[PDB]
Amino acid sequence: PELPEVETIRRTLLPLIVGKTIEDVRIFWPNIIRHPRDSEAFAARMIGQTVRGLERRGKFLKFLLDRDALISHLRMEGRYAVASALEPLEPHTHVVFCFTDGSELRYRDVRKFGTMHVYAKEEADRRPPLAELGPEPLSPAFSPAVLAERAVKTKRSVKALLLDQTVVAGFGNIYVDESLFRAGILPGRPAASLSSKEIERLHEEMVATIGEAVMKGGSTVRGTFQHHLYVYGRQGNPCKRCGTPIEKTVVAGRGTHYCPRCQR
DNA sequence: GTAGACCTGGAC
DNA sequence: GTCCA
DNA sequence: GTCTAC
Ligand SMILES: [Zn+2]
């Protein structure tokens, strides 16, 4: 899940929990709770608070309660669902919040990588993990200029620069490869070796890609945007623009898909 | 930079 | 049995 | 998806 997936979850979950008051919280896999460290304290501070709103910052979901904010990261398998407290839980359910009306919010995560933090509202943006986070791609904060300042100062690949959440928030393996394809730029190339015409071009393809994926409810990998993917997950398949077999190597320590003729 | 963690169930 | 994200 | 260790 990247910005489009996390943003879709946000729009689809808010109306199912707004106004509900928390009555109890249960943890079946402690390590998921990062702050406060003691999972018993995390559970007790939320009791009695009402869900007032739900926001997003990069790839993080930000639950807004009475005085606190709950910060949740889904990593690779994390998923949410609301249901009746009288029915059986699905497997791999590690954290559950029970509301005073008999319903509950369930969090599942097969690999157990997800994380959760909670702080008073006014302190959330000044502390980890949201503190040293970059600007939103669909906002004036992100521009061709703000993308150059960072590129003209490093040897690392251009893909390695886009995966970094401090540079720009929200992009992942799927949308980084797609964006670089639409811009005609090889992923393994140096960030400093990019011209101005390329920078602006890359900025424009990232905005148009993230925007499109959102209007389609994200992509279903592992939702209808996966039908619009050009390179991701298409090793040894004819390119949609030129017909050259898509290739797959390894850049920045991650699997990488690209077209050898279209990108350069 | 690229293995190596942190975990687990479908792929081949 | 075993390699993958 | 991220963080850490040669
Ligand atoms: Zn091509």
What would you say about this model in short?
By secondary structure, the chain is of the alpha+beta class. It has 7 helices and 11 strands.
Number of individual domains: 2
Inertia-based shape: elongated
CATH architecture descriptor name of the largest domain: Alpha-Beta Barrel
CATH superfamily of the largest domain: MutM-like, N-terminal
Structural class comes to alpha+beta
Number of helices: 7
Q: Any idea what the radius of gyration is? A: 20 Å
Tally of DSSP β-strands: 11
- Named CATH topology of the largest domain: N-terminal domain of MutM-like DNA repair proteins
The CATH top-level class label of the largest domain: Alpha Beta
Q: Which ligands are bound?
A: zinc ion
Beginning-to-end CA distance, first to last residue: 28 Å
Question: What portion of the residues fall into strands of 2 or more residues?
Answer: 15-25%
Strand order of the largest sheet: 2-9-5-4-3
**What kind of sheet is the major sheet?**
5 strands, mixed
What is the ordering of alpha helices and beta strands?
A: HEEHEEEEEEEHHHHHEE
Helix content estimate: 25-40%
